[PDB]
Amino acid sequence: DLGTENLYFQSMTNNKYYTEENKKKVWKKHMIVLKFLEQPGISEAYLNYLQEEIHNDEWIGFENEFFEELTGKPVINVG
Amino acid sequence: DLGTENLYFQSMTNNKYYTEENKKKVWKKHMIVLKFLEQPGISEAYLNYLQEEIHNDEWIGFENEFFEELTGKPVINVGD
């Protein structure tokens, strides 16, 4: 709803919480969302979102990750 | 489309790739998707997805994370 800040997101900006417990939790919740993004309709809406969001200068420090998502590059590096 | 597996997903199942480089990359791509999920429409579709997916026995070892997503719990644990 209008005017709310996403406290859960703001937590992820603070290196204090970048612990081994939370990195594992995020990795697994990411795998969960990845399967949602395969759903008909959602993939196309996600890409539309990415095309707008890459212009948003609030995402400073995320340039490589955005480029990768925007271009359909692997989620992780397999070496 | 039919019969393809998500090779990117399958990589994430192998502990060989659970490196500090990839954990950081995943954390940031997760933050990117989190803002997408705030978009009108998407939030409701995600929850509908979760309600089906929790019965999918293929997600063994993910029980706590699913429960948390299904019930709107914090993405990460902030102690305090």
Numbering used by the authors:
A (entry chain A): -10 to 68
B (entry chain B): -10 to 69
In the authors' words:
We obtained the structure of phi3T_93 alone (wt and its N-terminal His-tagged version; His-phi3T_93) and in complex with AimX. Interestingly, in the His-phi3T_93 structure, the N-terminal His-tag folds as helices and are also accommodated in the dimer grooves replicating the AimX contacts, supporting the idea that the phi3T_93 grooves are specifically designed to accommodate a short helix. Size exclusion chromatography coupled to multi-angle light scattering (SEC–MALS) analysis confirmed the phi3T_93 dimeric organization in solution.
Here we determined that the arbitrium system in Bacillus subtilis phage phi3T modulates the bacterial toxin–antitoxin system MazE–MazF to regulate the phage life cycle. AimX also inhibits the function of phi3T_93, a protein that promotes lysogeny by binding to MazE and releasing MazF. In all structures, phi3T_93 shows an identical all-helices fold composed of a longer N-terminal helix (α1), followed by two shorter helices (α2 and α3) connected by a long unstructured loop forming a V-like shape. The α1 helices of two phi3T_93 monomers interact, resulting in a W-shaped tight and globular dimer that displays two shallow grooves, one across each side of the dimer molecule.
